[PDB]
Structures are given as C-alpha cells and as structure tokens.
C-alpha cells in the first residue's frame, strides 16, 4: 500500500517506466506508522480463531 | 521398385541428397506414452504399477493388519469408440484390481498370519486413448498434449545486472529436488556467498559448510590455494599465478627477474617458468595485505598468535618469526581470476561451528522457538540427508551428476556434503570467469511430459488418498468379515483422473480441421499448464528460440498471438530420452568416413560434440568432399576440418516439424512468413474434392497416412469387394495367419460431424480384383487425394493489380472457381431438442403445436420429427415441442380479441427447435434418446427397428463374406490328400465341415476350420444379442431430461466474398470479388485466369517461395499439359513412355530414379491419366529445386523459361503491357468464413441481471461498444451519439422500449431518462453504508 | 500491418541498433599513443596498425575484457 | 464451494469486472453488427457497402415503421411477417429507408476518432461490409480478414452528427498534425507511378498533342505510349489574384500520361504538380497543396478522381514480379570474399596474440557489416537503371522499369532494405538479447537459406513477432 509492490521477480527495465506510481502520501504515513510499530509487538494476530 | 499404389501417380522428386533415416511414425510420443502407463510392467517400473507399488502394501495401525496389491487388469469397455461418441460418454476401461489382505495375532508381527482374502477390487475407470492417441471424455475427442517442464538438479542463473545500481551481476546456484527444500547459493552485492533454505532468510553460504562439520582451516583448504611463504621473508613461487600490473617487480638469486611497477606478462611469466624460480624473496611489507591460512599459536602458553582467515599485519609476520617460525600460508586471493569470497563470507559469518551453525540454520527455519543441539541437528538432518524427505529423482540426479561434469549418471537420491562442495566450487567459479551460467530456455533443463506420465501422477494422487482410508479402516476393528471390497469405493481414486482428463488445460480438443491440424496437435509441446509457467509470469525468457532447439522443436511453428513460443511443435525426427528430455538422431561419423548408424543425442549431450550439416556432399565411400565442412559445435557454427567432425545430421528435414515441412520452397521465405503459412495451413477446411498439390515436398504421403483419416491395408491381398461404405480384402495367402479365415473388412467412415462441424469421410481409393500391399492406403480420409495430404486446390493464378480489386490483401476471385465447387465445403452440425420436465408438468416432443398454420408442419411426421431426408432453411421446425404454463391473465383488448373471434387460450407455449437463421441444409441423421421412464415415440421405435436390422444385416453379412473366404481357404485346404475336387462342390456348402478326407494333419485342417466357422457362428450370436440388448436398453440421460432428439443438419458452404483464401507461404487474403470468368485476364490461347494476385505484397513480405512455387506450378502443368494432349490424341505409348521418362528424370543429380522400360504398358496408361491434370512435383524443405531446375521443366513444356507470359484483359481485350506472372499456386480455404462472422441485431435478447443486449452471435447478441469508442465518440461533439449508445441502445429499460416505438410510429427522438448501470451502482452503494442520492434537478 | 510487418520492424531495429554499438565500439580513427595507458608499455606496432588508436595492450584489454564481462 | 475468494460490495464496484470498468462505459449495444470487411474499390469516401442482411436486421423498426405507414402491411405484426419472408417490397422500403441515413463504421482498436466514421450505406449482395480503400489508413485495417463493426444512429441528432461531424468526407485530416489522412496508398501509387514516369524511346516521341484530351485518345487507340515524352498544350487556372482564377495555356513537356492525369486535377493546382515521376510522398504532396488552395469539396473529388485513375492505369500497367526481377549483382561473392579474406586475417591475427577475443569479435562484426553494405549498394546500383535505344541509335541510361524497384522507388511498397534481403546478401542477425550473431547469412532469397541460416534467422525473427504480439497487448496505455 505504501507503495512499492512486493514481487517475487525483479521488474524490467521498462514496467519502472511504465507501471504507474499510486499512491501518496497520506496512505504513506499511515502505512509506515503502522509498520515501524509492528516490529514491536510479536504476539500480534488476526484470525478470530487464533484468539 | 514401387507400392502398387503409388505407380499410380508418382511425385516427381527434386532435393539430390540421398534420405538415410526415415520418417518415424509421427504419434510415437503419444502412443508410446500412454502405452508404458496403462501396461503390465513385470519390473514395475512404469504406469499403474509403479503407482500400486508406491501406495501398496498398506499396514494397519500396529501392524494388525496388511492391505497388500496382487494385481491388475483393464476390464474392456461397455462400448467401442463410435457407440460412445454417440451414447455420448468416456471410452475406458474399468480398473480391476485383485488385492489381498492378511491380518496377524499377537507374538506374530512378521509371524503366521490368522488369515487372508483374496478379492478383485474395482478402483475407477481410465479412459482408453484411441489408435490415433486420442481419447474419448464426453463424447468429444480430447488431445492430451505433451507438457514441457523444468527438471530436478542444479541450476547456475544469474540476474544479469539488472538488480544492482552498479550493474554487477549477481549469481545464484539452486538445487531444485524433486520432493524437499529448495537449497539455493546466491552473492551480495559486496560478493559475499549467502544461502538461503526455502527462499527464507538469508544465511552466510558457510554457515552451511561449519553445518557439515567443517572447520575454517578446512574450508580455506577446501576452497583456496595456499601461498606458501617460508623463513628471510622469502616466497615461494608458482609462476602461473603471477599472471598480472604487478606488485613487487620479481627477482630471485639477486641479479633480476623482471622490475617494478610495470605490469606483469607472459614474456616474463615464461622467463620465471623457463629459469626454474622456486623461491623468491618479497619485503615485510607486501605480505601485509595477504590473508593467514590456518592456525597459527605461540608453544610458550600454548596460546594462539592467530587464528584461520585471519588479516597478516607486519606485527603478526614479526611476532610468528620470533616464535621460530618458517613457514607461513596465506589466500590465494587474486582479484580477477581467483576471487576471495569464502574469505569475506566467514568474516560476515557470525557462527564458529556446527553447534552454533545448526542453532542458525534452526532460527531461520523454526523461528522463534527455543533450540537445542538434538533438535537442530534433527531438523539439519531431515533437510536433506534423510531419505524420507529429499529426493533428487532419477532425472535429478542425473542432471546433477552431469551438470557437475562428472561421469556418474546414476547415484543417490538425497545430497552430501560432497555434493554441496561442488556446487558452491560451481558458483565461485562461474563467478571467477571460468564456466557460464545455464540458459532457462535450454532444452537440457526442460523435460516433457505426456499422457502416461501426467495420467500416473494423477493415479498416485487418488491412491494416496485410498491410502488414508484403508489405514484407518484397518485401524477401526479390523474384524473378520470386512474384505478387500467394502474398504475402497471406487470414487475417489476415478475423481482425479476423470477431473484431469476432462477439466485441464492439456486435455482440449482435437483439432480436426484436416488431418495435418491433428497430426500438429498431437505432436504438440506446451510450456503452459499446471507445473509449467503460467502466461502472465513467463518472459521474455522462454518465448524464445535456442541453439538446443535445433533438432528438437521447429522454430517456425508456433502460434502468434498471446502465446509465441510457449507453443512449440515437435520436430520430425525429435524423440523423447529414457529420463524424458528431447532428443535427436544423428548419423555417426568415424574418421572421415560418415558411417551409417545413428545415435540420439540431446540437448546436454549434443554440446560437446562437434555435428557436421546434413548439406554437406560426400564421397561414395562416406568421406567429405569439403576439406572444411561447416558444422555447429557447443553454440556455434564454424568451418573444422573434416577430421574433427563426430556426428552429422540425420536429415536436412530433421530441424521443421511436419506442418512447416509442408511449405515448398521453404528456404526462400522469411521465417515469420513461414510461422504463419505452417499456423493458415492447420486451418484449411477440406474441399469437396480434394486435390493433391502440384508442387508438394514428399511428406505428404507421409502425414496423410500417419493420421488416422486413410484406411490402411493391414496385409496384402486383392480386394474382392468394393463400395462406398466398405471394402473387403482377399489375403495373398503367404498373410494368413493358418487360423484365420482369410479375408478382412474395412467399414469407411461416410459424412460425420467432426470437432468443427466439417465433413469425416472416406471415399474408396481401391476398384474390384486390383491387387493391395500391406500399408496401401484403401481409403482416402477427408482431405487426401490417393493416399497424399491434399489441403486445398491448385489455382491458375496471376499476379498483377487488376482495378483495386486485390488491394490490400484482398484476392481477386474468378467465376469459374465458384462453378467447380473447387472450395465447397460440406459443414455438418448437431442440434439438440432437450425435453424436460419443468414445475408445471412434462413437455412433449409433439407434432399438435400452438399458431403456426400446418405449413411449418408439413416437414414434420406423425411424432413430431423431420424426417430424414428433407431440406430446411433457417425458421423450419425441426423438432416440435409444446410445454406447459400457467394462464397469466392475457390483458383486456386481448381478452376482448380472443373473444371476438373466440380463439381460446392455448395454455402450452411453442418452445420448439426451429433451425437457426442462416443455414439451409439437409437433414442428413436424427438420433432419439428416450430416459427408461418415458416410454417411447414412433419415431423412437422406427429408428430402432432400423438401427436393429443394420446391426443384424452387418454382422450377417460379415459372417458370410467371412464364411465364402473361409470355405473357399477349406477348399484350397481339400485339394489333394484325401482329395475332392471335382464333387467337392457337389454336395452342399454346409456339408463340408463333416466333409470325409485322409487320416491326416489336413483332415485336421478342415475339421479345425470347420469349428472355427463354428466359432465365427456363435459369437455372432452373441454379437448380435449383445447388440439387440444395447440398442433397445434405455438411456442415462441427465437428471430430468425426458428425452433428447439429435438432427444432424449438413450444409455445404461454397465460396463468397468475404471467405478468407491462404496460401501455403503465409500469403492470406479474402475474397473480395467473384469475377465473370469473361472479366478475367487471358493469355493467347483463350484460358481465363482463375484468381489475380497482388505483386506488392512480395517484396515487403519476404517470401518468395510463393513465386518459385507458382514458377514449377506452371512447369508442372506444362508438362501435364502435354501429357493430356498426348492422351487425347491417343498417342501410343512408345509416345508416352518416351516423354513421360524424359520428364521424370530432370535435374542436376536428384536422388529419385524411374524406369518406364520396367512398366507394365497398362501401368503406364493409368501413371499417364493421373498425371494429365499435372505431373506432381515435390521439393524437400532444405532440399528442393534449384531455380535452374525450374526453368528446365518450363522449357520441357513450351512455356517460357522466364515464368511471365503476356496477358489480355477480359473487358477490353487489350494486351496489359509488361508482361505478367501466371502460374500454379495451391491455394487453401481457411475455416474463418463470412457467414460464421457476419452478425447483426436489432434488438433481441437482454441480460438478466445487468439488463444489457446478450453477447456474442449465438445469443444474437450485441456490439461491445467499449471505452476507447466512447473516446472516439467525445472526440467529435457526437454529445447525442454517445447518449443513446450509453442510454437508449444499451441499459435504458424504459427508453430503449419507447425508442422502438416511436422509430415504428416514424418520430426519431429519443427521452433517454437514465442507465440501468447507474441504478444498480447506486444501490450497491447504498447497500454499503454511502448514503448517495441525486440532488433535487 | 499483417502482423509480421511490425515484427519485420522490430527485428530490424533490434540488428541495427546491435551492429551501431558494436561498430562504435571499434573507433578506427585515432590517435597515434604509442605506449599503453595502463601498464605504458611499448604498444606493439602490429596492434596500432590493426587498431589504429588503441588504448592498451592486449593483455591490459583482456583483463579489462574479463571484468567488463562481469560487470562493474 | 471452491480456491477463490467471494466477490463482495467493494469487489461489485471496483475491478475491471466491477461496475465502473465495463459496466458503466462498456457496454452491450443494440441496432449494431460485425462482419468481414473487403474492398469494394468503386465507392465513394462517404458510402461503404453494407449487406442486405445486415441492413435488413438493423433497420428493422424503421422498415416496420415503413411498411405499416404507406399501408404495405396492415399492423406491425404483418410487416414483421412480411419482413420476414423478405418479400419483394421489403427490398424497396430498404432502399427508401437506407438512402440518408449514416452507419457508423468501427475497428476494435480505437486508438483515434478516425476508428469511427459515418459512410452512407450501399446495399450490396454478399455477407461482406464494403469498405473504401482510402480510408483504411485511418482503421489500421488491411482486408486479410480483419472485422468492422456497423452501429446505426437512431436519432435525428445523432443522424445529423454522423452526417455533420464524423462523415468520412468531412475527416480526412490527422487531428495530430493537418496532413491529409486520405493519402493513396499502394495499388493506387503504383498506377500513377507508372504513368507519370517517362522513358527514353517510346512510341510517338515529340508528337507535339493538342492537350490532354488528344493525349488520352492518342494512348487509348494504342498509337503512344504512356510515357512517350510529347509537347503538349496545357491550361492551368491560377488564383493568383483576389481569388480570381486567371487562365494560362502554354506548351509543356511532358509524358502521354502526365497529361492523361492532368484530366484529373482541379483547376487551382499548377501543373508541376504532377510534370514528376509522382511517387508516394508526390501524391500525398499533391492532394495537401489541393487542400491549401481549393478546400474540402474539391479536395475529397479528387481523391476520389485519384484513387480511381490510379487502380485503373495499375492494372493496365501489367505489374507482376517474377524470378528474374531480384537481379543479384554479379560483384557479390567478389565482395564476400573479400570479406571472408579479412575476417581469415583477422582470426590469424588473434590466434598471434596481437589481438583479444571481444577485440576481434568487434572487428569481425564491423567487417560484416561492411561488406553488407557494399552488397546492398552494387546490388542498387545494378537494379536502379537500365540501358535503353533511342533517337539517333545510340545506347543510353534510364531509369529502371524493374518490378521490383518500380515498387519500392515509387513508394507504393518496399523499400531498399527488403530489397536488399531479397537479392543482395542478408547480413548479420541479432540474437533476442541483442547481441549480433557473426555468422552471417550471405545468401538471399532469391538463392536459399540453408538450415542452419534459416535457423539463425529465427532468433530475431521470433524476438520480434513476440514483441509485436505483446505490444498489442497494451496498445492503449
Ligand atoms: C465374390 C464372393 C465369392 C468369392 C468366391 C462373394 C462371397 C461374399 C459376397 C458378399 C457377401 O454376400 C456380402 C454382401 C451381400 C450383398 O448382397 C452383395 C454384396 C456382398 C458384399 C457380397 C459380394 C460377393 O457376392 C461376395 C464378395
Ligand atoms: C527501424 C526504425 C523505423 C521503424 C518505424 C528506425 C527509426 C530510428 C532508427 C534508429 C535511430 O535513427 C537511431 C540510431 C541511428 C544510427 O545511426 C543507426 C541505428 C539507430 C538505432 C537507428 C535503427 C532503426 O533504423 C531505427 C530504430
Ligand atoms: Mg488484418
Ligand atoms: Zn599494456
């Protein structure tokens, strides 16, 4: 969401060029300040059957 | 000497190299495969019992009990081939499995077993692949096609510097098993060598080698030379390593070596060498950037001075010299050649030794979790060094062992330390220069796959899943009574296999255009699939060709479009390996002399060598008459001395599949032209009359009878009796099998619906009393000509512009082509009337249907069907069914109109199969399926009284052909020894089977016969009840289906604008005029043209071939010509033989030779007819006539050597100037024609939910008016265009009906109010928690 | 267009552009050095004769040759 | 009951399978049909054929309309039967309701507004759509069997913004840049290519003709030929005024078919206009000079008077191509082995040390390419003129009447390039990386390839059939 699209290849030369870049920047602090705390908590989860 | 049916027209036969190899038989992938699935292997190695025995022997929970696999059998089908695809099911085989299960008592583990049962299980259905490698799986005949997957073993890649800003590429070895955990090497930027396990974090790469329980001093020595310094301050030398820019200068015994600062080099390294320098002596300050090799401590405390890998500063070289130390060693680091990266690794690698390496490796698979040293080095273990879970395969470790270059091809299954050594030597050295990385799209990292593998893969599947159930079955109880037959339901292991053939994407429809289109689509590679890449993260990486394709898969045919190269073809010679990977033949070549057996090489293997070309001329005695022969080695092509050169080409065919080795004059196209001429001719619809091509190559015969389309005799003999239905076959007695009856049946295929609504039909070839050869063609299939693949038809055709009329692409067609029926095509097609029974009652198939006024049912008989035999256009009724509904209360004005004329309500609406518009056919067939509930209709019972008496009459009837060869062998049998020859027919046909004869073996032979008659006797007996009980048993129609009534329309398709013309060397066009046959251009002699071409579309398109190929098209019709006129003047055959052997023996040295003066003078009478149209010609794809040769065969008839005769045009008979080019180009009606894509609406049918028009023409549907229209749209000012496409013609329910009104009332306006899209958009945003609303106007 | 126009195109531009850069590489016309730049050795004079304006020796431009194949 | 997730609210909005995406501007549409386009050369810029059935199914509630207001059919059902029976009236209320009444024409790509135009229909026999061949530069469409599809407009508005504003004669400019979109194309280039485009003795030579009309009866009677250089009398009408239009007659030289073409042109144009060889960018020159002096009506008139003259005198042209066109040079295997020689030299060199590996590759690859280039240009420079007689007796060049130079010289199709491929050498190929095979192909097409050229060929060729496969794809970006 950041964002920055976690692939599993590397992109081509052309689809940096191409891909189009979305979207800045309210979602980029949210984002970043949920993943500078979700280091810090481990036992963190979200399946209601975990809980 | 020639096949009896091929003196009947010989091809006459350019391409001088001799053929050494030939052709296989082209379904060996197929057939092979699936043979070594479904067969008894004995040393199960292969198919079902491999899988049998890789689930069995089963053992219970203790071991109480045993379920253990005796064996097998495929029980036969319920119904053949033909009865399944009209019953309309799978064609297989059950499944009958015999298995055993033994159960123990206490103190017994091993020990006497209480008891055991014996029990032939039933575990599924496999469906039966046909004689052509096709099956049957509703019905429909599926292809399975062949899959082309990446292997087990080592792969070298890297990522070719686009990952890094710098650009320095970064290499990677992965070990990919067949079952386990993907080991994988890779470098960092900084060139440090990292691991990682399953793609997870990453490790230092040595981590791995302290795992393995290595010490650094023994990975130095592992992966590192030791430069050795000694004590002062002297080195010792290896010269070669001092390659060089060099350090200190060189000097040894103190007069010089070589001075300081310039750079080091060969002159110098051979004066080092050639002086014998051992040891030199450098300063105490250049061992100061070297690295320490191993331990090194100081004998005082027993302490230690320095460890391994450890940096050498001056202070350490004085503190190890004042402890009496000589000897010194150090890294071996160059910077180019002999890289330092283990160095840096165990510097960046936090770990010292197995037991914190394991605690790593633990960490990083097993997070979090609080380690041991007995669970670390369990699970280290168990990663790949424990049987049970690590299996490099038999490929795998084969590909390992090879791709390591060593010589071991067959070894373990799980990996080694040594085996991890190798590999990480493998990846420095790449990284050091020496070696290169593997190619992904290299054909020795990709295996195949075909119907026997994929099919047992999906068999395991099913057995792993009987496997969980039987184990707990035998956990529960394991009481007395419960057999081998209540524990395995036959479900769940049939699932995986009718799931694979029906619903996958390699089982997929034959194509059946023509038999080359089937022939193509089973010799067919796909790269797509499940376990091959998908489409959407392919490449850019495997869509293109490689040198390892040479051989193996043709290089021009594959498909254009979505998928270019993920569709390759299988090459003519291509075979598959034991392991699976591609391979090809090659004739070996000892000293100089090319001998004459061929070996398989692939892909891996055919890199070392060094491969001569099949072009390349030789003596008699197999020697080169090239000093330097061109030959390819590993990646290039070169000339080597004709010494050097080990294999050679098998064929010059032997690099094209079969479908672009079809393409005459092939060398002269550009090769994108030839992908497309190989993909149009897989589309050709066969004509109504085929026509074998005039310039063909010679492959042919070849593709015509390996398809399944020809009947082929099975053994020589006379054929006794001719029909259009079947032809009956006299052995020549030397094929008699001394059993057998003598003579065998052919029954042909007449008009059938193929996959694409064409015609399957054979037509006999064959007259009565001519003799047969085993593997003469008896019957021509659909789209051969006398045993030839015959696509299309060979047209006169010109090439010049003619008034725009051929302008772009288009084709310029004469009359007299559309008289000949020359592209006629019969299309036949199926359509259904599916009777049900709906809420409100059942619906009847009846012939008392509602309003339509007993004209529409005069086709119709009493039942309600059209007979067979009647000529519908489209709106005719077919079949008349009436179903139930309700009343719903017809509005006033209605009511009052049904009361004013008193035509009460009918209550049964008309849902009745009338023919769909457009298509005017004959009614050529009507199959009726009655569920065993309904009972059943006349027509119903007619056409199984007719069905009945066909049966019966054709079992009879074969019974006594079969019984007439049978007593003519008897009486051949009673010739002589206890003889009657004379009275033999004397006393009657029946009392020959107790005819009298000596006590002989031969008395023997007539009573031996006469059981056998016997026998042929009782079981058409049983044929016949089997028969009678399978016609007249109800169906098993779908659920609540009463009844299903089949027509089978046949239509025949003649050619019109708009029809889509092709020729073989990717010329496309479409038809755009049918001119009069007096408006076409004329040469002298009166002969009209029968299609115009366009000359511009050649020279951009870079096929020539098309040109040579209309060149020896009118060469072959010269002569042919010639030949026509010789034998309507009756000429005598000194004439005929005289010019026809003048004519077949032209050209530089061509391989083919024909003697006429070995002729019989009525074989050269009938050779002289079929070569009156014109003389076949054929031309091998590499091979084939020089252009010299053609303007021979012009000048051998009195055409022009320059191929271009003057013309006159048809309206005004004025010599065109310059003249034109005329010829013989074999043209091709493609299946895209214009009444299968004309469509049109104006208003019909609306989707439910998003009341839209239907899609598509079978739907009569609408247009996708899409969104770059409607940029095109706004782009004008069409503000009201856009309005109504948007509005009106589109989604406006209520706009789009007062829109037709007032277009019929004659009031174009329209009142668009607003788009159901929009509607539902705004409810669907509402029914989230938006509360959106339209604001007051 | 026809499909294989535009391939035509395509490969056409692709071999163009491969043979400029490896015809630029070349740089016949130069200048006479005479002595190399990385080791200033005598640049013998059948390599400035067949590649006027070299730079480097042959041994000098192999060991670049290695490192350039690399990258970096 | 399956792998794949749920489709939801936000998933019943969002996504190219959302409402947005194809629901909300794509959609589904009524009144409209497809079929396979052909030539039909004989129209005019603002008429395409349309099939009697197509027509007959779109039109259908305005025939209704017909057939039930001059009483042929008494209610609606009865003309829905008699339309049905295609019935003898329904053709002339077809042609009645036809007459004014635009289609919209329209290829799948869309990438301008020129992949949509207004045509008169034509009704013509056939299930093929008729389609003007000037205006296939505007659809990207050649007719190897690509589809149009025909929508109708159903308003009087959107009847007067078809004929108003998309109507083919009213777009026949790039809205990217002014220059005219109706240039002829290749059939059409060639004719007059041919015919103006003189030759050194032809017959009647230096018969001074009265004016174009006695050129053209002179031709047509057979007594010149079409390029036979004549003095003759021309009229050019100059607006060189206040729009005035003043007349000049003088005696030009020119060919018999420089002035059978003069016939066509408007009377604003100058005659050098057409006093060239006219090739490709001639034409296109021609009819944009008519379009910066005379305007639209007279520009669309021409195009029209060109399109037909040029299929006309193509045809009379004979134009094949033969065998013998692709005259390969007699100096080529001198040139390769000149070639071969150098690159031998150069590998010896190697082998000696004096050079390095990637060193020699470079010298090896411009060596090769060099010699492609000599190649190409003797093969040119033999295949661009030809030796003729003549006046006096003496032998004397033109310019070729080669087929396969015509072609590509006029511009009509080709270019020095393929011809190249075609009888001079092929050269060297690339590999999909981009690196350059230096083995090269140094035959022809007229000659073969052999396997293993032809297999090298296969490497650029299938890189750039993926490319092109791919790039359509996304063509809209
Ligand atoms: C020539 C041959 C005799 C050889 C000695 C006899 C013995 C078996 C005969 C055929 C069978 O009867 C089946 C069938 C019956 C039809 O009625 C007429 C056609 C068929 C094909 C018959 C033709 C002919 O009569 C046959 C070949
Ligand atoms: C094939 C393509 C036309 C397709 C429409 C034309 C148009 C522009 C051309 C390139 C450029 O000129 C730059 C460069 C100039 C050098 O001097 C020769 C090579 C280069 C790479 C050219 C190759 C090719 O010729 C190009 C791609
Ligand atoms: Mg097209
Ligand atoms: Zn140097």
Redesign the interface.
Known sequence: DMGIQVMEEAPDADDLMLAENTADEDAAEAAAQVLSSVESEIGRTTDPVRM | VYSYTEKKRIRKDFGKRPQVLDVPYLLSIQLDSFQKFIEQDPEGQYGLEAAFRSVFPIQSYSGNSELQYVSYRLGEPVFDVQECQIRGVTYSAPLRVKLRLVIYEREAPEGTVKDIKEQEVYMGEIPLMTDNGTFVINGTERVIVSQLHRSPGVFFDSDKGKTHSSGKVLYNARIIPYRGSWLDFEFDPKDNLFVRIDRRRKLPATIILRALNYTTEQILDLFFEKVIFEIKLQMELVPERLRGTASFDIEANGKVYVEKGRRITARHIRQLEKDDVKLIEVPVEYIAGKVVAKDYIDESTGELICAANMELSLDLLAKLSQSGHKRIETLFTNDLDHGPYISETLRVDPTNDRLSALVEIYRMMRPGEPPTREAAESLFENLFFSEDRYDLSAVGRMKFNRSLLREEIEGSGILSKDDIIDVMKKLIDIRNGKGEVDDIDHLGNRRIRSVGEMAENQFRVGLVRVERAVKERLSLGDLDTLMPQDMINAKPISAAVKEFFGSSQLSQFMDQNNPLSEITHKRRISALGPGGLTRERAGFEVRDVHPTHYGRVCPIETPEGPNIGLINSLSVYAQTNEYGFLETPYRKVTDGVVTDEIHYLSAIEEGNYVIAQANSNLDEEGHFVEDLVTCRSKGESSLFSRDQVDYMDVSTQQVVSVGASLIPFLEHDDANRALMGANMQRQAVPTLRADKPLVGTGMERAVAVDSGVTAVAKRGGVVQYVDASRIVIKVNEDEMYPGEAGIDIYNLTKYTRSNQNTCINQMPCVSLGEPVERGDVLADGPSTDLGELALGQNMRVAFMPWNGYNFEDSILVSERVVQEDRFTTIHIQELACVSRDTKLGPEEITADIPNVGEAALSKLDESGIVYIGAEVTGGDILVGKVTPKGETQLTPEEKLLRAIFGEKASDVKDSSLRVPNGVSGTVIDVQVFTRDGVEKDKRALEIEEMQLKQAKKDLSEELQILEAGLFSRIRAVLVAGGVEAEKLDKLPRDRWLELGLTDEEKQNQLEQLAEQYDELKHEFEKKLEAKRRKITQGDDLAPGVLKIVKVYLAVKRRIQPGDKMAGRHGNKGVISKINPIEDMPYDENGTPVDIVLNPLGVPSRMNIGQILETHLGMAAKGIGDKINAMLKQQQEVAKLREFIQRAYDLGADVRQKVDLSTFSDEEVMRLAENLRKGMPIATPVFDGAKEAEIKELLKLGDLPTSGQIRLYDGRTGEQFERPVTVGYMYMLKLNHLVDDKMHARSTGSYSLVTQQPLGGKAQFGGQRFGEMEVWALEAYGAAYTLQEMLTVKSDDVNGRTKMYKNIVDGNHQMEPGMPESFNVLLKEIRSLGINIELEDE | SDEADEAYSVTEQLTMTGINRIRQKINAHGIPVYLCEACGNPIPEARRKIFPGVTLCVECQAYQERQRKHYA | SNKRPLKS??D??KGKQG??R???????????????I????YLRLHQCGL?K??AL??????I??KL??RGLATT?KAAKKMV?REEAVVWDILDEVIREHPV?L?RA????????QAFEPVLIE???IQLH?LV?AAY??????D?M???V???????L??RA??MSTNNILS?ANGEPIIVP????V??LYYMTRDCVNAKGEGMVLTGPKEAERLYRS?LAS?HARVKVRITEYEKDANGELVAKTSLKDTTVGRAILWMIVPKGLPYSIVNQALGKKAISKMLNTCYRILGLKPTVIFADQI?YT???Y???????????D?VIPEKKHEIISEAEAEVAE?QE?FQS???????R???V??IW?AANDRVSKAMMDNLQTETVINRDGQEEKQVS?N??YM??DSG???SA???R??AGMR????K?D????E?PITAN??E?????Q??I?????????????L???NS??
């Open positions: 609210l936000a019943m909005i409402r947005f194809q629901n909300l501007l794509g959609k589904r549409v009524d009144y409209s049909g497809r079929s396979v052909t030539v039909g050369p099939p059935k197509m199914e779109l039109f259908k509630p305005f209704y309309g039930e207001l609606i049905e919209l329209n790509p869309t990438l301008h507004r020129l992949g949509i056939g299930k093929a061949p296939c990207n469409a050649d007719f190897d069997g589809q599809a025909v929508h407009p159903l308003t009087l508005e959107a009847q913004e078809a504003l998309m809205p194309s290749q059939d059409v060639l004719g057979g079409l399109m040029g299929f006309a193509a045809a009379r042209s004979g134009a094949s191509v033969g065998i013998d692709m150069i060199q040390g004096l050079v390095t590996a990637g060193e590759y470079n010298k690859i411009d390419a009447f087929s396969i072609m590509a009509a199709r080709g390039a393929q011809i491929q075609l050269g060297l190929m690339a999909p981009g690196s350059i095979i083995t097409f007229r073969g390839l052999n396997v293993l032809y297999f060929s296969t490497h650029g060729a299938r890189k750039g059939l993926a490319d092109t496969a790039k359509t794809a809209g970006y």
